[PDB]
Design a protein around this ligand. Structure first.
Ligand SMILES: CCCCCCCCCCCCCCCCCC(=O)OC[C@H](COP(=O)(O)OCCN)OC(=O)CCCCCCCCCCCCCCCCC
Ligand code: SF4
Ligand code: SF4
Ligand SMILES: [Zn+2]
Lengths: 90, 176, 376, 111, 71, 114, 57, 208, 45
């Protein structure tokens, strides 16, 4: 009609992606009952606390404090640069 | 990696520079969008026409409080003093004292409705599964002498709809 | 009106026209935070990290929940993290929908606001379906994500994402090369120096200014390493090349949300070891061991060993700190938060001397200063 | 190159002799410090090994690798200031021994 | 003294009362020794607790549940 | 005690200082008293200033007497300018607050165990 | 360097109000709640003040 | 152990042993202790003398850059006999590392401003004067940020009872909005969470 | 309820008169809906 392409005379054209989704193509509801699995070492006869151990780990290891061919060691290697990452990088 | 944006140079040749002098002086741009991308009004408005129509939600929503009771009623709360002790804001206030038969229940239970920050920490600590955030935004009265709740305001406010509540948990309780 | 969803009172002595002086008064929103987080346990005190800023929600707490798992020597299970990329990188679509617009409501336009917030809504559902609430939603925890997400959302994330790169093409034809805007911003508030580092600025007003560094790919977070993206960069240090990051940084995200829907492996959600995670409502409700770790876990907290940390992230407008001492028992000790707003606004007075007054309204908008955060 | 890269700088101009001024300028001044404190044993040791790479290869581009700075024009400003400390370093005196150990129980963390 | 606050305000109070609403229940029986009290339906209700009825005539309703229970 | 003092050295340059900024206060009470459009007897404004400077009298030490100053040196910034709106000032002179007994038998009929 | 030794018993004044001289603090070792046998709630000398009236609202 | 326990990494912990070995080597007039946090971070315990000095060495060098100042903060500890603490925190852009610099103090002893070294300690030093009370000399400006114009208590230290000493309320008897002592409507209940048995053996305090 | 040709304005309601001790019509608030439809009109299910 005469108002359909006068919406298409500007901003290119869409007619597929449209702001209000109001029409169909949505998700309906939660129909199914789900079941959430428990995997991670949940079983018996083996899983034993004191091998899984999340916590109980030591105090911060010291270094020489009060009471040699050094290369001027830096804390780590310096950073190598980045690419220019072809996408349309200009 | 990287990218470089706003790094470009004009071409500088008389096939171009007209195209940039047919722009400044004739306004060939700046009517491109707002001569057009504005209109583009011909789309259906998006409005939820309020007093009647209303918008979406989910079964996990949070809001006005309640206290359920089983079938023939026990006042499901046992006064185990938990939904009180995880409360960040410290709204809750509970005073038990042994009821006549010898089963324990409450006396004073007061959720302040100004302090409550709407966690979802008092829906999730109750082991006997009493206290439950309702899905009704009914609120807004005209005096702060009010929103403080007692016990016997809550129960009704939670027996006014239990057809709302008792059908949400049985959607949601299979996840947690 | 030009408060930018916040409250400030700044005072300038201008010279007849040019400002040449500014000295703002912050401290209108202080509220008294870090004095009140010594008094609350670990899981009880979480939200007061969500309520700090108003815009980024799951990106906070991603910076607390990563500053606790450390002191505990514990990692989330694999399906934990690959959530925290999907929400973690979906709220970078929030602060970049705001800071291109509610900045440019000061420049005076209308539609680039009433045109977008049609959409910033379609996202707020996805905070409501996943857990509860409209904005502030307490979901991430010390143990990875709270509870699983419904059957759904993966046909409401996919269907929504493939529509979105168009709307970001209605903020482009409406802005970039529109002259009256180009002229409101170019070569305005240029800090190109190595003071723009010396002040210790965070991300953008860096990466848009040359000096090239980001905390997403120089440090891993939570599996962030396994997806590919490129960090846009700017030419000259003015504002309109700190804008142009925030478009080409909304067109990178839709790469990751699109790259991260394909990989999410099935698995549990909470940390497994159960001293730091509560159990389900099937387990606490029958066997015995599942109270004494659900009924001492909702009064006192974890027991998190003493010793100090620090940590950092890339929040949509810049870094976010937590410097978390802990005394070796349940309630913390200093929890010191730093967010930008002690840099990006430390550098207004410097940046703007020599331009008019009607610029200083449009300088602020580019730092993305949002307050109650300067509760720092 | 026309773009200084990391912005705030400008390319002027001379490479290959602009560094050599400064390292040499560093090495001479640096010697006036007493020789005990390792500061010379390090502050110099990086410069000589650095200078070995300087002399000599084209283009300036392949001077970049094996000398990890930023771009060359920046490496100057890396070498510029390392002086401005040295010629202070004699003002206050690091090399001297330690002063005022804290009151003997201070850094012990769990109170 | 206190009583002048709800004047004209109609004083919300709880029409039903559970102080005892319990005793109307047909107190059950089993014919066995110890029982499982999980109430109100599976996985909505009190945690499972087993009670012994051997007295003569009594029972014990676990005290979460309240519902009069015996043999 | 060995730590570097702040400004003063012992008690004299110090007690030259407290004498000093007194006048900056004493010379400027009243320009405000017309500026905020607050109404009081201008002599009140010269009683309080002299009521405060006599208050902390027992101070035995430098670096205390310099510490207090650094507070006192500040206020003349705000007050001689307008960073307060009438209600950060007048709070000095407490209008509304009902009197305290401070005597004995007036307590014993009101309040438990102070 | 201005080391300037002296001795004045350290005190500080003006920050609180009348609660300087009115009250009496107390320094005491907590006593172990006796319903349980855990001995680790001891070991730090705290302090806590006098208690004044709480009334009803 | 693997599945739920955070996998460690050694390499990061070897170097930050070295590179921190020798900044106790070349500035022994100042640095009085150094160590390695089990998570691969460093803490340099420095006398209060060097503050401007040490950073200035950390300010520029070819072996340690540390140009980016991130977070200044404080902690206040009673029964440390020198109350407060500072913690500087600095990122070296080239070498990808964090090294924190701890310097103690008191209230009365001044500390000297870092402002000419970095211009980003301009605010972070104005703040601390408000909160804890530490007094930074030779600071281009010293004023009141984060707090109202009335607080004479310097709150975040450990002696300020949480609710401050004066509530505020407005009355119409005149005009103003005036300040009457704090009267609450609820006690602010004090719970008590600290459980016995000492669950951590590794941190076990000295036997005594 | 509309034909399922809209989203969010597809489900709507009508108020009529004097529910419970109520003013007649031109007073309409929206707390009136029976506590069942909160499981319907709000699109919770
Ligand atoms: C032989 C016969 C003669 C032959 C002659 C050939 C043709 C010559 C006639 C051309 C004259 C046309 C009108 C005059 C030119 C337009 C006015 C103009 O020059 O604008 C220049 C303006 C300056 O911008 P600039 O130099 O780039 O500096 C900013 C850099 N940041 O750059 C600009 O773009 C400013 C744009 C206008 C500013 C306001 C726009 C606001 C929106 C209003 C648009 C609505 C008007 C549409 C007309 C409606 C008519 C019914
Ligand atoms: S509901 Fe759960 S928490 Fe609230 S009182 Fe009854 S038992 Fe204690
Ligand atoms: S609702 Fe939120 S705030 Fe109110 S009590 Fe339950 S948890 Fe505490
Ligand atoms: Zn039962």
């Amino acid at each position: 009609r005469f108002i359909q392409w006068l919406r298409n005379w500007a901003s290119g054209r869409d007619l597929q992606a449209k702001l209000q989704l109001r029409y169909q193509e949505i998700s309906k509801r939660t129909q199914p009952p789900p079941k959430l699995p428990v995997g991670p070492s949940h079983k018996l006869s083996n899983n034993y606390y004191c091998t899984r151990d999340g916590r109980r780990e030591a105090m911060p290891p010291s270094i020489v404090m009060s009471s040699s061919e050094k290369k001027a060691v830096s804390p780590a290697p310096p950073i190598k640069r980045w690419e220019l990452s072809q996408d349309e990088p200009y | 990696t990287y990218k470089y944006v706003n790094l470009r140079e004009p071409s500088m040749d008389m096939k171009s520079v007209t195209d940039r002098a047919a722009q400044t002086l004739l306004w060939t741009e700046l009517i491109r969008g707002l001569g057009m991308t504005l209109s583009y009004l011909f789309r259906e408005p998006a409005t939820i026409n309020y007093p009647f129509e209303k918008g979406p939600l989910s079964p996990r929503f949070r809001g006005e409080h309640a206290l359920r009771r089983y079938p023939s009623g026990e006042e499901r709360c046992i006064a185990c003093k938990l939904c009180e002790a995880v409360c960040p804001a410290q709204a809750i206030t509970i005073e038990a004292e042994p009821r006549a038969d010898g089963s324990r229940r409450t006396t004073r239970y007061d959720i302040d409705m100004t302090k409550c920050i709407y966690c979802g920490f008092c829906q999730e600590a109750c082991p006997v599964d009493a206290i439950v955030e309702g899905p009704n935004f009914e609120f807004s009265t005209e005096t702060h002498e009010e929103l403080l709740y007692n016990k016997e305001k809550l129960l009704n406010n939670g027996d006014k709809w239990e057809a709302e509540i008792a059908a949400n948990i049985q959607a949601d309780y299979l996840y947690r | 009106h030009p408060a930018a969803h916040g409250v400030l009172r700044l005072v300038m002595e201008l010279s007849g026209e040019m400002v040449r002086k500014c000295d703002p008064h912050i401290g209108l929103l202080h509220r008294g935070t870090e004095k009140l987080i010594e008094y609350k346990t670990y899981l009880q005190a979480l939200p007061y990290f969500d309520r700090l800023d108003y815009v980024s929600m799951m990106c906070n707490e991603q910076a607390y929940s990563l500053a606790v798992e450390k002191l505990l020597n514990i990692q989330p299970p694999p399906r934990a993290q690959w959530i925290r990329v999907l929400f973690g990188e979906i709220t970078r679509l929030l602060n970049h929908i705001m800071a291109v617009t509610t900045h440019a409501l000061d420049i005076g336009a209308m539609t680039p606001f009433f045109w977008m917030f049609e959409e910033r809504e379609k996202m707020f559902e996805f905070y409501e379906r996943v857990s509860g609430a409209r904005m502030h939603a307490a979901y991430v925890r010390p143990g990875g994500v709270h509870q699983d997400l419904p059957l759904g959302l993966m046909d409401d994330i996919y269907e929504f994402s493939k529509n979105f790169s168009l709307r970001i093409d209605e903020l482009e034809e409406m802005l970039t090369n529109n002259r009256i805007w180009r002229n409101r911003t170019v070569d305005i508030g240029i800090v190109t120096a190595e003071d723009a580092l010396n002040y210790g600025f965070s991300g953008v007003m860096l990466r848009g200014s040359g000096i090239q560094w980001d905390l997403r790919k120089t440090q891993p977070y939570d599996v962030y390493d396994q997806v590919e993206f490129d960090v846009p960069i700017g030419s000259r240090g003015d504002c309109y090349d700190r804008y142009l990051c925030r478009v080409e940084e909304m067109r990178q995200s839709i790469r990751i949300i699109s790259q991260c829907l394909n990989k999410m492996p099935p698995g549990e959600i909470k940390v497994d070891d159960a001293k730091v995670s509560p159990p389900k409502r099937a387990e606490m409700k029958t066997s015995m061991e599942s109270l004494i770790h659900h009924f001492k876990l909702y009064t006192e907290g974890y027991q998190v060993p003493p010793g100090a940390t620090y940590t950092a992230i890339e929040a949509p407008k810049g870094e976010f700190g937590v410097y978390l001492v802990s005394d070796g028992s349940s309630r913390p000790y200093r929890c010191k938060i730093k967010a930008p707003g002690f840099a990006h606004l430390a550098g207004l007075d410097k940046m703007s001397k020599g331009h008019m007054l009607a610029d200083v309204v449009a300088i602020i908008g580019t730092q993305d200063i949002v307050f109650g955060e300067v509760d720092r | 190159k026309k773009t200084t890269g990391l912005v705030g700088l400008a390319v002027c101009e001379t490479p290959h002799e602009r560094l050599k001024i400064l390292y040499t300028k560093i090495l001479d001044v640096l010697g006036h410090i007493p020789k005990n404190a390792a500061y010379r044993k390090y502050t110099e040791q990086i410069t000589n090994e650095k200078l070995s790479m300087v002399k000599a290869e084209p283009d300036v581009k392949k001077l970049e690798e094996r000398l990890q700075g930023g771009q060359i024009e920046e490496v100057i400003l890396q070498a510029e200031n390392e002086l401005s400390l040295a010629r202070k370093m004699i003002q206050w005196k690091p090399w001297e021994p330690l002063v005022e150990e804290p009151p003997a129980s201070q850094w012990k963390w769990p109170i | 003294y206190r009583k002048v606050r709800f004047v004209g305000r109609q004083k919300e109070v709880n029409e039903n009362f559970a102080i005892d609403l319990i005793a109307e229940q047909p107190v059950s029986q089993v014919g066995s020794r110890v029982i499982s009290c999980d109430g109100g339906g599976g996985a909505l209700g009190h945690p499972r607790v087993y009670i012994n009825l051997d007295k003569e005539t009594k029972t014990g309703t676990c005290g979460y549940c309240g519902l009069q229970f015996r043999q | 005690t060995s730590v570097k003092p702040i400004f003063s050295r012992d008690m004299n340059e110090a007690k030259r200082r407290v004498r000093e900024l007194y006048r900056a206060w004493y010379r400027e009470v009243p320009n405000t008293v017309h500026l905020f459009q607050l109404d009081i007897s201008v002599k009140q404004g010269r009683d309080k200033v002299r009521e405060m400077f006599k208050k902390n009298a027992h101070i035995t030490d430098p670096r205390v007497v310099d510490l207090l100053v650094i507070k006192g040196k500040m206020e003349l910034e705000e007050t001689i300018k307008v960073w307060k709106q009438r209600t950060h000032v007048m709070r000095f002179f407490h209008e509304t607050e009902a009197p305290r007994p401070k005597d004995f038998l007036s307590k014993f009929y009101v309040g438990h165990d102070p | 360097i201005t080391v300037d030794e002296k001795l004045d018993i350290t005190t500080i004044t003006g920050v609180p109000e009348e609660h300087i001289k009115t009250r009496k603090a107390r320094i005491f070792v907590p006593a172990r709640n006796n319903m349980q046998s855990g001995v680790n709630n001891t070991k730090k000398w705290k302090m806590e003040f006098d208690t004044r009236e709480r009334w009803e609202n | 152990t693997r599945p739920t326990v955070r996998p460690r990494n050694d390499v990061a912990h070897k170097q930050l042993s070295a590179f921190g070995e020798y900044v106790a080597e070349i500035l022994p007039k100042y640095v009085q202790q150094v160590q390695v946090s089990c998570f691969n971070e460093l803490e340099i315990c420095i006398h209060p003398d060097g503050v401007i000095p040490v950073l200035t060495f950390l300010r520029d060098h070819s072996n340690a850059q540390f140009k980016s100042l991130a977070d200044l903060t404080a902690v206040d500890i009673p029964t440390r006999q020198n109350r407060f603490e500072i913690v500087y925190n600095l990122l070296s852009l080239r070498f990808n590392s964090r090294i924190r610099v701890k310097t103690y103090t008191d209230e009365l002893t001044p500390i000297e401003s870092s402002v000419p070294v970095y211009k980003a300690a301009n605010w972070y030093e104005r703040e601390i004067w408000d909160m804890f009370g530490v007094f930074f000399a030779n600071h281009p400006d010293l004023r009141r940020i984060l707090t109202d114009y009335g607080f004479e208590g310097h709150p975040f230290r450990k002696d300020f009872p949480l609710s401050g000493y004066v509530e505020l309320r407005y009355d119409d008897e005149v005009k103003r909005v005036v300040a009457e002592p704090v009267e609450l409507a609820q006690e602010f209940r004090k719970f008590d969470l600290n459980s016995p048995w000492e669950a951590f053996p590794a941190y076990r305090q000295p036997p005594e | 309820e509309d034909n399922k040709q809209f989203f969010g304005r597809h489900r709507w309601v009508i108020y009529t008169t004097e529910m419970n001790g109520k003013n007649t019509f031109w007073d309409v608030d929206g707390s009136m809906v029976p506590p069942e439809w909160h499981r319907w009109l709000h699109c919770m299910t």
